[PDB]
Amino acid sequence: TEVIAHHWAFAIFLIVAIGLCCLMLVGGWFLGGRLRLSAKFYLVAMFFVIFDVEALYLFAWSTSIRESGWVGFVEAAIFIFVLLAGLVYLVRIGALDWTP
Amino acid sequence: MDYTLTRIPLQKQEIVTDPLEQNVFMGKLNDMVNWGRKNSIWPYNFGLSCCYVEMVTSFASPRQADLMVVAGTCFTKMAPVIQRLYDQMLEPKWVISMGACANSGGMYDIYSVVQGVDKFIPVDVYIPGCPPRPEAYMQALMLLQESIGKERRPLSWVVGDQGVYRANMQSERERKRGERIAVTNLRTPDEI
Amino acid sequence: DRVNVIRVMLSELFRINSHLLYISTFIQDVGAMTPVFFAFTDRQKIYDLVEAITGFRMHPAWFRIGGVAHDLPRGWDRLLREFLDWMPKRLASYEKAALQNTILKGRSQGVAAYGAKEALEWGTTGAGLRATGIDFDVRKARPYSGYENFDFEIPVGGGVSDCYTRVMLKVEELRQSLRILEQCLNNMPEGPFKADHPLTTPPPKERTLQHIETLITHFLQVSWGPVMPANESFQMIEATKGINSYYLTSDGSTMSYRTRIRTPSYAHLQQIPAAIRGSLVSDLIVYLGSIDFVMSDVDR
Amino acid sequence: WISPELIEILLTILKAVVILLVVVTCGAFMSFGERRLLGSLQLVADMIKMFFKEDWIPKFSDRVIFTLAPMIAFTSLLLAFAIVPVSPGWVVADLNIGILFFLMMAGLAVYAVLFAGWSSNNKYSLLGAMRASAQTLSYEVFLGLSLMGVVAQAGSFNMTDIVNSQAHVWNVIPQFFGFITFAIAGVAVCHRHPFDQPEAEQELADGYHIEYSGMKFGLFFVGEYIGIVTISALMVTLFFGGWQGPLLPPFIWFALKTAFFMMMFILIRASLPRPRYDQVMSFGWKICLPLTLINLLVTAAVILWQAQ
Numbered sequence: 001t002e003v004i005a006h007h008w009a010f011a012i013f014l015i016v017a018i019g020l021c022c023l024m025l026v027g028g029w030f031l032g033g034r035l036r037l038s039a040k041f042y043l044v045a046m047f048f049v050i051f052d053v054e055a056l057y058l059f060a061w062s063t064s065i066r067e068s069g070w071v072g073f074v075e076a077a078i079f080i081f082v083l084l085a086g087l088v089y090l091v092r093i094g095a096l097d098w099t100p
Numbered sequence: 101m102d103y104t105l106t107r108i109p110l111q112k113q114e115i116v117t118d119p120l121e122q123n124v125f126m127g128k129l130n131d132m133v134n135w136g137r138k139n140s141i142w143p144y145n146f147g148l149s150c151c152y153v154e155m156v157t158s159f160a161s162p163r164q165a166d167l168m169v170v171a172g173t174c175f176t177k178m179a180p181v182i183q184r185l186y187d188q189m190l191e192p193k194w195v196i197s198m199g200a201c202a203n204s205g206g207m208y209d210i211y212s213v214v215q216g217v218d219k220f221i222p223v224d225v226y227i228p229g230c231p232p233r234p235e236a237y238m239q240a241l242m243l244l245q246e247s248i249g250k251e252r253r254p255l256s257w258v259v260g261d262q263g264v265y266r267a268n269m270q271s272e273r274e275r276k277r278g279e280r281i282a283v284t285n286l287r288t289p290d291e292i
Numbered sequence: 293d294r295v296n297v298i299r300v301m302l303s304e305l306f307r308i309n310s311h312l313l314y315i316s317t318f319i320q321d322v323g324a325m326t327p328v329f330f331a332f333t334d335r336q337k338i339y340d341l342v343e344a345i346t347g348f349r350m351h352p353a354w355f356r357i358g359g360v361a362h363d364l365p366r367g368w369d370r371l372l373r374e375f376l377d378w379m380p381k382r383l384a385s386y387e388k389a390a391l392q393n394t395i396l397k398g399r400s401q402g403v404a405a406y407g408a409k410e411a412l413e414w415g416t417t418g419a420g421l422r423a424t425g426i427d428f429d430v431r432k433a434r435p436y437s438g439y440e441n442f443d444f445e446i447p448v449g450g451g452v453s454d455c456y457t458r459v460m461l462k463v464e465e466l467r468q469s470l471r472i473l474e475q476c477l478n479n480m481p482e483g484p485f486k487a488d489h490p491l492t493t494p495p496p497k498e499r500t501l502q503h504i505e506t507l508i509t510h511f512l513q514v515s516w517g518p519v520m521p522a523n524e525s526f527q528m529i530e531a532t533k534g535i536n537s538y539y540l541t542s543d544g545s546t547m548s549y550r551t552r553i554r555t556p557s558y559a560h561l562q563q564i565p566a567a568i569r570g571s572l573v574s575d576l577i578v579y580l581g582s583i584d585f586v587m588s589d590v591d592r
Numbered sequence: 593w594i595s596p597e598l599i600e601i602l603l604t605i606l607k608a609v610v611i612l613l614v615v616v617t618c619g620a621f622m623s624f625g626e627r628r629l630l631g632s633l634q635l636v637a638d639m640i641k642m643f644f645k646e647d648w649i650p651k652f653s654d655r656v657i658f659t660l661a662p663m664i665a666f667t668s669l670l671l672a673f674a675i676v677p678v679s680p681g682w683v684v685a686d687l688n689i690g691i692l693f694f695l696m697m698a699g700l701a702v703y704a705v706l707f708a709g710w711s712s713n714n715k716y717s718l719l720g721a722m723r724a725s726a727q728t729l730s731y732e733v734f735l736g737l738s739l740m741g742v743v744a745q746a747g748s749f750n751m752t753d754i755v756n757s758q759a760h761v762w763n764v765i766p767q768f769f770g771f772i773t774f775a776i777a778g779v780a781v782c783h784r785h786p787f788d789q790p791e792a793e794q795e796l797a798d799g800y801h802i803e804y805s806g807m808k809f810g811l812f813f814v815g816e817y818i819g820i821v822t823i824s825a826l827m828v829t830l831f832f833g834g835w836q837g838p839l840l841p842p843f844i845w846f847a848l849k850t851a852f853f854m855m856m857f858i859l860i861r862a863s864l865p866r867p868r869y870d871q872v873m874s875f876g877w878k879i880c881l882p883l884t885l886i887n888l889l890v891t892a893a894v895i896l897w898q899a900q
């Protein structure tokens with residue numbers, strides 16, 4: 001009898017936000033009378049994807065930080081060490097600088 | 101005052117009377133629309149020869165600006181660019197012709213100069229003289245602001261007359277005639 | 293002498309205007325802290341000075357045949373003195389700002405630096421010629437309008453015509469123009485502002501209004517035009533962005549049989565395929581910004 | 593059919609709609625506020641002008657994603673604001689994932705730029721969209737870790753638990769590295785001035801705002817500013833004291849701190865120049881990400897040390 005009201009508020013918020021944008025767009029509408037980009041952009045998107053999925057393990061670690069003891073801290077520390085080893089490998093090879 | 105309309109340089113315009121002289125809701129709504137078009141004006145300062153530094157020092161993507169400042173000389177090779185940029189803009193659109201080069205031939209009556217912007221697109225507001233001061237441009241902004249404040253344009257393309265109404269405003273030379281003729285003495289040019 | 297000194301004064305004022313505009317538009321793209329407000333006061337005050345001396349600010353239309361259109365007023369000394377004691381710290385600030393941004397100094401110093409041969413076969417009469425080391429200025433080699441009486445040391449570059457050597461030479465040219473204006477303000481002649489030749493168009497205005505013969509000369513020179521002997525003349529000066537030249541052929545009539553205007557920006561723009569031959573688009577835009585050409589000056 | 597449960601539910605609906613209108617008008621009004629800091633009826637006049645202008649669909653484009661890119665740019669970072677609590681009894685979303693939801697919205701924010709870049713049938717606009725999208729990916733990669741510093745300090749994702757863990761000490765002073773990394777990431781993702789318009793190094797690149805006229809451009813124009821105000825709300829509710837103050841009412845305190853942080857954003861507009869693209873990417877990959885990983889490890893050791 002409170003979370004149902006909160007879910008209803010979320011629903012009307014979403015529905016009336018999209019409805020406001022729709023009515024705004026149609027009120028603007030009603031009145032008045034062979035190449036290739038690159039490969040480094042794909043590489044930086046792939047860096048974002050892989051480090052975001054490793055950041056997912058950090059996301060799930062951050063909620064259970066206290067309930068897992070020092071052994072969980074050690075495991076997340078060696079996880080982050082592997083992550084930073086990959087990042088510093090990427091830094092040192094030269095695949096991370098842009099140089100336009 | 102009387103009004104001219106354009107309905108669908110070679111177009112036809114004749115003299116009519118405004119439809120507000122006859123729905124009081126439409127009269128307030130049209131006034132609010134004209135007010136909103138008045139106080140919010142985005143210019144498109146066209147890049148041309150040498151009124152640039154007068155629009156540079158006065159204070160801009162195309163197709164969002166409802167006002168176009170044609171400043172420099174209109175040449176035979178640049179006039180299609182002017183026409184293409186004018187048709188790129190969306191109605192309502194207004195034109196300010198800066199300098200003599202845009203009002204007329206502007207000291208160039210020669211083969212490679214188009215004699216004014218009026219030859220291909222209409223011009224709403226003119227500013228005379230080789231390079232006008234930015235205050236003259238800002239006064240022309242006042243002039244076009246009040247001209248926009250008195251129009252009668254269609255609100256929508258479903259119901260209403262499908263023709264914009266321009267106002268036959270009183271000219272500035274007759275309005276300023278008393279203040280200009282009633283000038284007795286001036287400062288002599290031997291001092292500063 | 294007074295006509296020559298006035299011509300030198302106004303020419304160096306407009307050269308200061310053009311150099312300030314070029315330096316402001318070359319320094320805006322990197323720092324952009326105060327690149328336009330710092331330059332706006334100087335251009336506006338010299339425009340007010342030109343407005344006091346002449347008519348409106350950009351195009352004076354004030355150089356007449358045999359002299360100038362009017363005399364200097366009784367307040368030009370105060371305006372020029374207030375101008376000249378207020379600019380040296382601006383020049384120090386400009387040198388500081390041109391030395392502070394070392395990122396531009398390491399970026400623009402490498403690409404497309406022609407030297408001593410491409411600036412001599414492609415035209416290139418502006419700051420590129422003196423940046424290549426060729427000490428050739430019209431004001432010192434073929435003096436005109438009494439430039440021998442002014443002591444100013446023409447600055448030259450060394451080696452190549454870099455994008456930084458050109459703006460350094462234009463800063464030093466601003467300093468030389470300020471020194472020329474100081475020398476003009478120091479000892480000013482008190483002679484006539486128009487020559488006594490009968491072909492000075494127009495004649496002096498007071499004698500036009502109260503002498504019949506001066507009215508005759510003004511009537512015929514204004515209306516039909518000054519009748520001029522059939523010859524050919526060529527005047528070559530150092531303009532604000534290079535070397536300008538007017539070559540006039542007269543057929544004996546009141547108009548010109550031929551006017552040839554050799555402009556520096558034409559030769560400056562003709563050589564851009566010779567240096568963007570294997571460069572990038574951003575390099576091309578940087579080179580276009582670093583070149584003092586003007587398109588209406590190219591097309592006359 | 594008059595029942596007090598229906599009255600309370602309708603009052604909650606009223607709370608949702610007033611917070612939506614107040615955040616929309618807050619963005620719209622301090623758009624003019626920033627333009628003055630660089631006449632509140634001028635935005636009303638601008639809205640009237642934009643409503644009475646024809647939306648141009650390009651004839652080489654399609655009528656779906658060309659209009660759906662401003663849809664994303666407005667509504668995604670609009671519903672990002674539903675997370676933010678302004679008061680104990682004036683919250684619209686009390687769901688458990690109070691940080692992951694903002695991460696969803698920030699992840700979907702890149703769709704607007706990409707879809708606009710394709711929708712503008714223009715190679716230069718596409719290249720500019722690629723540059724902007726690469727930048728915002730390169731900063732939203734560690735946006736999550738900058739939030740996980742505070743998440744690990746406060747335990748759960750719920751913002752109520754965050755602001756109740758801010759009772760003894762705000763999270764700005766133990767985690768300043770997380771604060772600056774989140775500020776940098778929020779500047780870059782919302783396209784604020786230093787990490788803005790990456791077309792400055794190539795003339796073969798153009799903006800994605802081009803070929804957008806009228807309402808489809810006004811959607812971006814108000815969407816970036818609603819985004820920066822909800823990023824400021826996220827910032828205060830995470831690092832500063834959410835609704836926390838000695839004397840003045842809590843919503844007054846929240847409004848004051850939000851206003852303070854976007855005047856700080858005005859100071860950002862005034863002070864620093866725009867860095868080069870290579871410097872921006874090299875910064876966001878080499879400095880920010882190891883620093884926030886080290887921050888997470890340090891706050892883990894801290895919160896596991898004094899755990900008694």
Ligand code: SF4
Binds near residue numbers: 151
């Ligand atoms: S009016 Fe004068 S200053 Fe303006 S474009 Fe024409 S010639 Fe140049």
